[PDB]
Each structure stands twice: as C-alpha cells, then as structure tokens.
Amino acid sequence: ANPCCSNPCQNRGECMSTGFDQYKCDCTRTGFYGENCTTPEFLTRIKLLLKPTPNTVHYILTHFKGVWNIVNNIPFLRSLIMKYVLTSRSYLIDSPPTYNVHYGYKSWEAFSNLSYYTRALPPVADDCPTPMGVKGNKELPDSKEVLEKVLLRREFIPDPQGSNMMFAFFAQHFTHQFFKTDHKRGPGFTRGLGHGVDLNHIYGETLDRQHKLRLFKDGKLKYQVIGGEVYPPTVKDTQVEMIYPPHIPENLQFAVGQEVFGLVPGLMMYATIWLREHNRVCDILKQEHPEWGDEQLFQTSRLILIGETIKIVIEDYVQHLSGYHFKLKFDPELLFNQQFQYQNRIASEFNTLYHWHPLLPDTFNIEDQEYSFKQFLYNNSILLEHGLTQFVESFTRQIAGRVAGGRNVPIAVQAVAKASIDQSREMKYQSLNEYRKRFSLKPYTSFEELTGEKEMAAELKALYSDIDVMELYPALLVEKPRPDAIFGETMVELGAPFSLKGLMGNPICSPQYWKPSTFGGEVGFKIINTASIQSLICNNVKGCPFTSFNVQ
Amino acid sequence: ANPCCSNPCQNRGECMSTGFDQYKCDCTRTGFYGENCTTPEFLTRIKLLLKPTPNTVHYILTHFKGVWNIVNNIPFLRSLIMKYVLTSRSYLIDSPPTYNVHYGYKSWEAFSNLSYYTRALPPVADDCPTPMGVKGNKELPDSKEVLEKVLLRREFIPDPQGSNMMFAFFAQHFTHQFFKTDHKRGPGFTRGLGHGVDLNHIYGETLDRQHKLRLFKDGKLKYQVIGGEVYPPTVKDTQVEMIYPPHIPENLQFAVGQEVFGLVPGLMMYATIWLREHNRVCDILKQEHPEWGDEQLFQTSRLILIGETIKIVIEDYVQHLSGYHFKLKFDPELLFNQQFQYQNRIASEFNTLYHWHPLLPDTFNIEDQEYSFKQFLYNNSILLEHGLTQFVESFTRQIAGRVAGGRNVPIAVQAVAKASIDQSREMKYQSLNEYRKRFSLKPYTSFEELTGEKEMAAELKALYSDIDVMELYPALLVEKPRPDAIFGETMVELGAPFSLKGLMGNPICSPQYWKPSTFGGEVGFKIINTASIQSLICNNVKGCPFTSFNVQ
Ligand code: HEM
Ligand code: HEM
Ligand SMILES: *[C@@H]1O[C@H](CO)[C@@H](O[C@@H]2O[C@H](CO)[C@@H](O)[C@H](O)[C@H]2NC(C)=O)[C@H](O)[C@H]1NC(C)=O
Ligand SMILES: *[C@@H]1O[C@H](CO)[C@@H](O[C@@H]2O[C@H](CO)[C@@H](O)[C@H](O)[C@H]2NC(C)=O)[C@H](O)[C@H]1NC(C)=O
Ligand SMILES: CCCCCCCCO[C@@H]1O[C@H](CO)[C@@H](O)[C@H](O)[C@H]1O
Ligand SMILES: CCCCCCCCO[C@@H]1O[C@H](CO)[C@@H](O)[C@H](O)[C@H]1O
Ligand SMILES: CCCCCCCCO[C@@H]1O[C@H](CO)[C@@H](O)[C@H](O)[C@H]1O
Ligand SMILES: O=C(O)Cc1ccc(-c2ccccc2)c(F)c1
Numbered sequence A, B: 001a002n003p004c005c006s007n008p009c010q011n012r013g014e015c016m017s018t019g020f021d022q023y024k025c026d027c028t029r030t031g032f033y034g035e036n037c038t039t040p041e042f043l044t045r046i047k048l049l050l051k052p053t054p055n056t057v058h059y060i061l062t063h064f065k066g067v068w069n070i071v072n073n074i075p076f077l078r079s080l081i082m083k084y085v086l087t088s089r090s091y092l093i094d095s096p097p098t099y100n101v102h103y104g105y106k107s108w109e110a111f112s113n114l115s116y117y118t119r120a121l122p123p124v125a126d127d128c129p130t131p132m133g134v135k136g137n138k139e140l141p142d143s144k145e146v147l148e149k150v151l152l153r154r155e156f157i158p159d160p161q162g163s164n165m166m167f168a169f170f171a172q173h174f175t176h177q178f179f180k181t182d183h184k185r186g187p188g189f190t191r192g193l194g195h196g197v198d199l200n201h202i203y204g205e206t207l208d209r210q211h212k213l214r215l216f217k218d219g220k221l222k223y224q225v226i227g228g229e230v231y232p233p234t235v236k237d238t239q240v241e242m243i244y245p246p247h248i249p250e251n252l253q254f255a256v257g258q259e260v261f262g263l264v265p266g267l268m269m270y271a272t273i274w275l276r277e278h279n280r281v282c283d284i285l286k287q288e289h290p291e292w293g294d295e296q297l298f299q300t301s302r303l304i305l306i307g308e309t310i311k312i313v314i315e316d317y318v319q320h321l322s323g324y325h326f327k328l329k330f331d332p333e334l335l336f337n338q339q340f341q342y343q344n345r346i347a348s349e350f351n352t353l354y355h356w357h358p359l360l361p362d363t364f365n366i367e368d369q370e371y372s373f374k375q376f377l378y379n380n381s382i383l384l385e386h387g388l389t390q391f392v393e394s395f396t397r398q399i400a401g402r403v404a405g406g407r408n409v410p411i412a413v414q415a416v417a418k419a420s421i422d423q424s425r426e427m428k429y430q431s432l433n434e435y436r437k438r439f440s441l442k443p444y445t446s447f448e449e450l451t452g453e454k455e456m457a458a459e460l461k462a463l464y465s466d467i468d469v470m471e472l473y474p475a476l477l478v479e480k481p482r483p484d485a486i487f488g489e490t491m492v493e494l495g496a497p498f499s500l501k502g503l504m505g506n507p508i509c510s511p512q513y514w515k516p517s518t519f520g521g522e523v524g525f526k527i528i529n530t531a532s533i534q535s536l537i538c539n540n541v542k543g544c545p546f547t548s549f550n551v552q
C-alpha cells in the first residue's frame, strides 16, 4: 500500500509518499540524482572509479607486515592514517540520530526520546505486503529451522584468529554498558540512557545506585576483602538491586553497577578488576591532591577510567579483532581540525550485530577444571575458589569460537539465538542486502556468494527463496569469513562505524575536555595515555600475570 | 583556602589546585602560556592587534546604511558575513558543556545530568573568603538596596530603538520554552530537558501531556471556538495541568503546553497564534499527503514550526534587537563546511541575562483601555473581550521599556528583580568583569565607565567598593546603553553566543535533517524558508493586521 515499501531510493536518499500510489526520492547531498538517486553526478563518477572495495582495503591492512612496521614508527603517518579511518568511518553514521522502531520518518519524538535505540535504516512499514517490504513470501522462514539448519554448533569451531576468553568476556563486559534492552518496553528500547561509554556498568546508571556503591572516603567504591583479595561488596551490605537466582547465599550476591554481571563469573572477574582500578586511581589522585575531597577524587577517577576504557578498547581490543598490522591509535587530537559530532546514540543493528555467542565454548576451562554452562552460570564461588590470577591465566589460554562461518552457536544458548532472529523481525528490520547497500557494500547475488560454500547455502535457498529476502543477523553468523579471520565483510563494515563513533563521540574526546586538568593534571592524563589490557591486569591482579586477547 | 579562588588563570585556561596553597593553570589551546596564560604566543600577538572591539564592529553594522543595502543584495556576500557571525559567535560556547552549580571541575555528573542549567563560568568554591573569589567584603551589598537605588523605575523610560509589546511578549513566549527553572530542586536546575527550541511550550514537555493536547485527527491540536474565533481548549476538557489562581472560572482555564502561560494574556496571545499555526500547517500537509495518518501529520507539522520559529527568531526578532542594517539570515547550509556542534545546553547566565522586565510598561494599553498589572495578570477574559486582532494592533502600537540605562524595573515586579540578584549569589556567580573577560571584553576600570553617567555610578561605588566586585545581573540593567539602543555591550556580547548556539545547535539544522523530505516535501520546506512575524500573524489573525517588533 505504502509506495515506499520497495525501498526504491538508493545511495542514502530518503523516500517520501506523494499520494496513495506515488513516491518521490529526496537526493539532497547524496552525490546522485534522478527518480531513485541512481544516476551519479560527475564528481561522484570519479570517486566510485578510485574507491577500493573493503576486501581490497582489508587485504592491504593484513598484508605487507614489513611496510606497516615502518609506517607504525613514523608518527606523522600513523596519525594521517588513523585520522582517515576515523573520518571515513564516522561519516556512515547519522549524527544527530534519525529513526527508531516506531518512526520511519524523521520526527522530534524520534530525536528527543532517549529510551529508544536509534536505527541505521528505517523500519519496514506495517502496511507492506511482505516482512521485507515487497519481496518474498508473506512470512519469513520459520526461525526454529534457520537456527537448527545453519546456526547451531555440531562440533566446536575455534577462532582461527586466536581470540581467547579474555577477549570474549571483555566484549561482553564492555558492550553490556551500552546494550541494556528494556524488556518491559520491548526490544528496540534501551535502559542505558548514556548511549555510549559511561561506565555505568561499574558505577550505576542512576545517582541513587551510585551512592549505594560508594564508600565516601577518598573517592573510593565500597569493597570487601575475602581471603587476602579485594572483591565487590554484597547486596546485603549495600542494598543495590542485583539479579541472582533465589538459591544464591547472601555472601556471594555481589553488588556491581550492572545488575546482571552476577550471572557469569567472566563478567564478575572484569567487574572486580575495574573496581580495583578505580580505587587504585583514587590512591594516585589523593597523593597528587591531598586538598581534594571525596567527590572530586571520585569524579576525576571515573573520568580517568572512561579514558582508559576507550584507549584499551581501540589499541588492544579492536586492534586484535581487526587483524591489522597497522597499529590503531586512540588520539582525540586527530579530529580537532575535522568535522565531527561529539555525540552518540546506540543503534539497534549494532546491538543486533554484537550478539557474538559463538565465541563461547562448550566448557569453561579454569585451572584443572572443565565447567559446563550449568555449573558456570550464577556461580561466583568458582571465582572465589580459583581467584582472579587463575582466571586471567586460564582465560588467556582458552581458545574462543569463530563467529562467522556458520554452525557455531552453542546449544546452551539456542534460546538466545532464536530470540535474536525473532526480535529482528518483531522490529521490522530491512533485509541483509539493504543493510549492505547502506554501508557501501555490494549486494550478494546468491547464497553461495554469501556463505562461500555449497551446503549451508543450499539449505538457506530452500528456506528464503530470494537472496534479497535474506536477513541480517543470521547472515552475519553464516557469512564467509575473511581468510583465517573471525568475521566476514558485513560484520566489520557495519560494526566499525557504530563502534568508533560510540568511542570518539564521547565528550572526554572533545577539545574542551581533552587536556590534563580534566584528569587531575599530567600524572592523571598519563594513566589514560599509557593504558593497556596488560597493565590494567598487571596493576590489579596478584602476580602481574600475562594476558592478551590472543592465544599464545 | 582553595588556591584557585582568585581566578588567576586568564584567557580561558583552567585552574587546578596542586596541594593546599599552590595552583597550576592548564593553558592547552588557549593561544597563551606562562603561569597564568597571560603571555601570548606569536600568532596570537598578531590576532589581538588586528581584532576590532565589539563597539567598533557595532558601529560598522549600525552605520553606512547605503553600503549595507548593496551588501544585503549580493547573496555571495550576505552569506560570507552571516557565516562569519555564526562561527565566530559559536566558538565562545563550550559544546559539549562543562560546569554547573555544583561542579567547578569537569565531571561526568555535570555532563550527563540534564536537570542542571550548564554554566559558562565555574561557581566560586564554597571555601573562598569572599562571595566573588577573594576581593570585596565578606558580604555583598544588601540586595534590596541595590534594587531601590539603581534598578527600580522612577519614570518610564521608553526604548529608543522602538521595541513594542509584540516584541516584549515574543521574548517572553519564546524563551519560556527553555527557561523553566525547577524551583523544587533549586535555581540552576531546569525543567526543560530539551535544552533548546523544541516548542514544548506549545506541545508539552512529556508525551503524556502532549497526547492530552492532541485531537488525533489530521495531526491537529485540540481547540475550542468561542465567538467566531479559535482558542486553546480548557483544562476541564483536556485534563492538562495548568497554573491558575483559585478564582478563575473553568471556561477561562485554557490548557496550553506550558503550564504558566495562563498567567499573562500576552503569552496566551502568542500561545493561541501558534496553535492556529500548527493546525493551519496540518491542512496544508493533509492536502499534499492524503495518504498520511495522524502521527505523521502531527510530527511533520511540529518540525515545520520548529523551523518557522528559528527563522523568525533570527530574521525578525534578533534582527530588530540587534539594530544592524545588515540583514541576518537563517540558512543551515552556511555551517555545512564548518566545524560546528549540533547540540546545546541552556546556561544559567543566559537565563539570568534574559530577565528583561524593564521592557514592561506601567499600564497595558489594549484598544481604548489601560490595564494595571493587577487587572492584567491571570485575566484572559481581556483576551476574549478584545480578540487577537485588537491585541496585535494595540501591542504593535505600544512602546516597551528600555532595558539597560538603569532605573527601569517596574515596581510591580520588584520581587522578581531582587530574586534575580539573590539567586545569582545563591548560585555563586563570578563577578561582572570575570564574565566580561570570559567573552573577550575589556574589564570596566570604574563604575562611571560602566554606567556612562555620574549618579548611579556614585551610588554603586558606595555599595560595592571595587568595580571587580560588581555583579553581572545588576550591571546589565544599569550599563551604558549603546547610542539610542536598548542594550549595553555586555548584554549583546554574552547573549549573542548563547542565542545563536541554541538556534543553530538544533538538530533540524544538521545536514541529515535539512532537506525537503524531512518537512513533507518542497511546499513544507517553503513554509520554513518564507516564515516571518508578519506572515505568522497574517495567516492566523482575523483581517491580516500589520505587525512588527517596532513602533511605526
Ligand atoms: C556465559 C556467557 C554468556 C551467556 C550465558 C549469555 C546469555 C545472554 C542472554 C540470556 C541474553 C538476553 C537476550 C534476550 O534473549 O532477550 C544475552 C544478550 C546479549 N548478549 Fe550474550 N551471553 C553470554 C556471553 C556473551 C558474549 C561473549 C557476547 C559478546 C559480545 C554477548 C553479546 C550479547 C549482546 C550484545 C546482548 C544483547 C544485550 C541487550 O539487549 O541488553 N553475550 N546474552
Ligand atoms: C507581565 C509580564 C511579566 C510578569 C508578570 C513576569 C513575572 C515573572 C516572574 C514572577 C518570574 C519568576 C522569577 C522567580 O521564580 O524568582 C519570571 C521569570 C522570568 N522572566 Fe518575567 N515576567 C513578565 C514578562 C517577562 C518578559 C517580557 C521577559 C522577556 C524575556 C521575561 C523573562 C523572564 C525570564 C527569562 C525568567 C526566568 C524563567 C525561569 O525561571 O525559568 N518575563 N517572570
Ligand atoms: C541530577 O542531580 C540532581 C541533584 O544532584 C539529583 O537530585 C537529587 O537527587 C537525589 C537522589 O539521588 C536526592 O536525594 C536529592 O534530594 C536531589 N536533589 C535535588 C535538589 O534535586 C537528580 O537525581 C539527578 N538527576 C539524574 C537524572 O540523575
Ligand atoms: C519515549 O517513548 C515511550 C513509548 O513511546 C514512552 O513510554 C510510553 O509512555 C506512555 C506514556 O506517555 C505509556 O502509556 C506507554 O506505555 C509507554 N510505552 C512504552 C513502550 O514504554 C516514554 O515515556 C517516552 N519518553 C519520554 C521522555 O517522554
Ligand atoms: C590504504 C590502506 C588504509 C585503509 C584506510 C581505510 C580503512 C577503512 O576504510 C573503509 O573502506 C571502505 C571502502 O573504501 C569504505 O566504505 C569505508 O567507509 C572505509 O572507511
Ligand atoms: C565585516 C564586518 C561584520 C563582522 C560581523 C561580526 C559580528 C559579531 O562578531 C563578533 O565580534 C566580536 C568582536 O570582534 C567578537 O568578540 C565575537 O567573537 C564576534 O563574533
Ligand atoms: C522610587 C523607589 C525609591 C528610590 C528612592 C530611594 C533610594 C535612593 O534613590 C535616590 O533617588 C534619586 C532619584 O530616584 C537619585 O537622584 C538618588 O541618587 C537616588 O539614590
Ligand atoms: O575501520 C576499521 O577497519 C577498524 C575497525 C574498527 C571497529 C571494528 C568493530 C567491528 C565490529 C564490532 C566492534 C568493532 C572493526 F572490526 C574494525
């Protein structure tokens, strides 16, 4: 009915209905013109000749290790390149934000209401004859069957890129501060109104909660000492709400800022490390500033950890999963003479794409043990029995699963994978190819092109009929990996623009904030600018054990 | 005790304490260096030699009317100048925002908590030996006495620039969508979490309230017809909360989106004009889009009125109060190849400075009548007796009061002016000169330099002792007006940057919003781009009366 159901406008133009059966595309600044913004301006025709595909660019970034070794040690050049990844990537995100679940047209409600996840592509309207607009059958293929046929794990597939459980739980930890779906509202509503990296998962989303978590001496965060070691305080002692099953004794009900991190010892590990680090930085800042009271130590410490997180997140975490020989850099200055919006809103598709469960193994191997999922969940005594050092040691050693490539979602969390498919459809996501187009990628012309193989591809073809009706989420986990990599094209290309904007749009990266005094002077800034995963762990975990995001 | 109490750092550098008795200034990007960022870099030395003073620049803009006639008609040039006014002004604002009443250092709480008005200058620490930092006596002069000696009106002083009551109530209507102090919390807290021009004063701050004001047919806003004429609906009918005194009969309890606009007929006049406008735009959009439902008509109309409001605010209202022969322009394209932040946070000092009560006359002269304040307040039957037409006609005719120049606050609102002094102090505002410096203005060296006259200055010198201890608010209203102007240097130079950021920082001005389809196509866009106070009133008031912000 809606004449815009077919998604007729290309190249980021907007469709608009002009009477019941006619539409009109708005091609403003798209670099194109014509009824569907398909015919290019001249300046544009040149750019599309010279623009290397993402796989070409990927090849260059993951070869010529000798040339990158040299380029990484010329500050001038490293700077030039990073700056081009930042500006080129960010330009793919609409900032200020545009759509949500309920608004396929720009609207003030869409813009002002912070409870919604935003949306890189508008939803498909409710009065469209098919779920993906105009193509395909009236119903998408049974979600249970997509799951079973191409998503569930038969035999574990290790990540060829060497990603380990320190990498896997770090993703889970860090992402769970900006992915917090408000299930009472529905999917496509968020409880993280910071829309970015604010460490509410350490410090709490609300002031009331933050105050319960705080000691009010020396800027510090309450804690308890068990054995010789520092752990987070109890629910009983603090009264902060936490989600624990009823059978959990009150001495193991740990209170951290994210009410869910009790659920997996992996989370609670990072949760403990970051608590120690906040209190660590407090001791440093008190020494530099005997004149400072508790508020200032506390707030400056938080600002410091916000900094460390973005540093660690770019130069270690993204660095590792990217596979690049070029050394990525966290440097706000790169964007000070560039056009850039220091603001962010987390996008449904980003949450959707970040469901990286195939990372998880069959068993969690800590020390001499192999814990099943059943044994591991909601079981913090494991963390206590072995201790942080042994966790970091064992999780550095244990290989994680490959995400793309298909058939590596562990059965233990099949519910979770099916929900991901079902909720995508509930939120009226557009098709895989509409998302590829949106991030400057060649649509897939067949399923065997998508998967790079014959069997999963043939299964998918019997289920969806047309490639243009294939869905994003399943496509991401089934896609052909890059050679010996954990991810395919689509995952990298959608992910990177969401990721770096969330990181660089933070206000501490803005000119007026990025200066020593914001962080308690030059010794405070240094903590940010020398941050790493090794030193985060070294300074906070007994015996400075080796870690990495990578198996050795 | 705080070694930063003296505000030692100059040129926008930040003070930091390094032990109990020593401080350090961080000069990053200030264009200066040294212990107090006083000694200029070379490139800076050149700029301060070529930089005209604001009163020089004011002279050029308000003279040579023959040269401007030509410049206003060369689109190339008008664009170049307006772009320079936008970028040069905006640069004086910190965006993302920095401080509030409770935070004199950068902090995540200051940045994330949208309940606070932000703050162009840090509050004076609580352990400073004096109310301005270190200068003056332990107490500021008795506020009642400052009020009575230099602020209260003896004889009505008309504005020399011709500002009339359409102007005065327009300033009132428009600003009360972003100045909404949360008195329960304290001053320095705001109830407008939009921090800008979102027309909540028309549509309501919350969804719950907005829905009660809506008709849910053709995107329209509920209304009633009394006499022939369209007015806003009642509280009885809609259930929206309004502030009315207990003696107000239910038929006169109009429900608008801002709960206070019941208390002055002037507000309720504009309140009605915009209501009509919103519904006028709905009929137009309905005609262009018979396929459109109620939500989209309603949201698209609101986007258009956000656009009209910014257009009129720049090209008519500011235009008039500026006194420039140069014709200011609303065109978001100007900023598309510029560094600019499409976000805003309204500032205490902006709210403080915008307390323009001297505008108000001794009597409100509608038609053949002269209503006292007591007769006018909370009395909408006056609005009903005369009708919108006679309001517009009479308010176009009646001069408003001069704001600067001293002694023009009408006795009827003396409470308000004293409050204003008291709450500045309560919020720990810095002195007049620290603000002057902060906006690139020569500190006043004497009181008589400030006032331009002897008598008020003498009185001020008896009360405050030192000019560096003079307060901002009083000084704005007692300042030497520009020749035959409503305002002094300090008002214009503080106001203009806060104003143009609020206007241009709105999202509709951003590349991704500013295109016809956002506004329902080319005809929708045209409403924005041809908007003016004359046509806002012509299209919506019986008999297309002439208006202006200026007496004829
Ligand atoms: C033992 C480890 C883990 C368990 C038991 C687990 C389980 C879950 C469950 C039950 C949900 C709820 C979603 C729903 O159905 O509504 C979820 C959400 C999610 N998970 Fe996994 N997960 C694990 C590790 C991970 C890891 C390693 C990643 C890597 C990034 C990840 C990414 C996500 C994301 C992005 C969400 C969405 C969160 C939200 O919407 O708030 N989780 N996890
Ligand atoms: C008959 C006309 C008016 C009356 C009776 C009036 C009265 C007041 C009163 C009683 C307050 C509250 C102050 C406090 O809470 O301590 C106020 C606030 C204010 N007024 Fe006036 N006023 C009038 C016209 C104006 C006009 C023409 C302007 C022009 C801009 C203006 C600007 C302000 C501002 C900016 C505030 C602060 C708003 C806030 O606290 O959020 N008012 N008005
Ligand atoms: C923003 O800050 C205000 C003030 O700091 C917060 O309100 C205070 O809230 C606490 C609850 O933690 C109350 O105990 C105080 O009485 C409040 N003070 C005042 C004067 O309002 C408010 O909660 C914060 N807003 C957000 C969104 O966190
Ligand atoms: C943001 O939007 C949501 C939903 O559109 C608002 O919550 C709705 O609020 C109304 C009341 O105004 C309730 O009747 C609905 O049940 C809510 N729906 C959902 C799914 O939550 C929310 O209040 C809006 N945010 C703001 C700041 O107004
Ligand atoms: C020469 C090697 C350096 C590569 C730097 C760019 C890294 C990411 O480059 C990506 O490539 C794609 C195709 O060109 C574009 O669509 C993305 O926007 C672009 O950011
Ligand atoms: C070509 C003459 C028109 C110049 C337009 C500038 C109008 C306001 O320009 C202002 O001038 C002040 C003094 O230089 C500065 O303090 C402000 O930053 C600047 O925006
Ligand atoms: C009208 C409100 C009371 C003001 C008078 C008492 C405060 C002192 O006001 C006096 O009035 C004269 C004109 O008003 C001036 O010439 C004096 O300098 C002034 O101080
Ligand atoms: O632009 C780049 O190539 C760097 C990069 C930056 C971020 C990511 C990423 C992708 C998905 C999720 C999280 C981060 C990435 F895969 C690569």
Ligand SMILES: O=C(O)Cc1ccc(-c2ccccc2)c(F)c1
Binding pocket: B085, B089, B318, B321, B322, B491, B492, B493, B494, B495, B496, B497, B499, B500
């Ligand atoms: O930059 C300019 O010169 C234009 C200008 C822009 C804004 C204002 C202003 C000042 C005070 C309050 C409201 C607007 C003004 F008086 C002038």
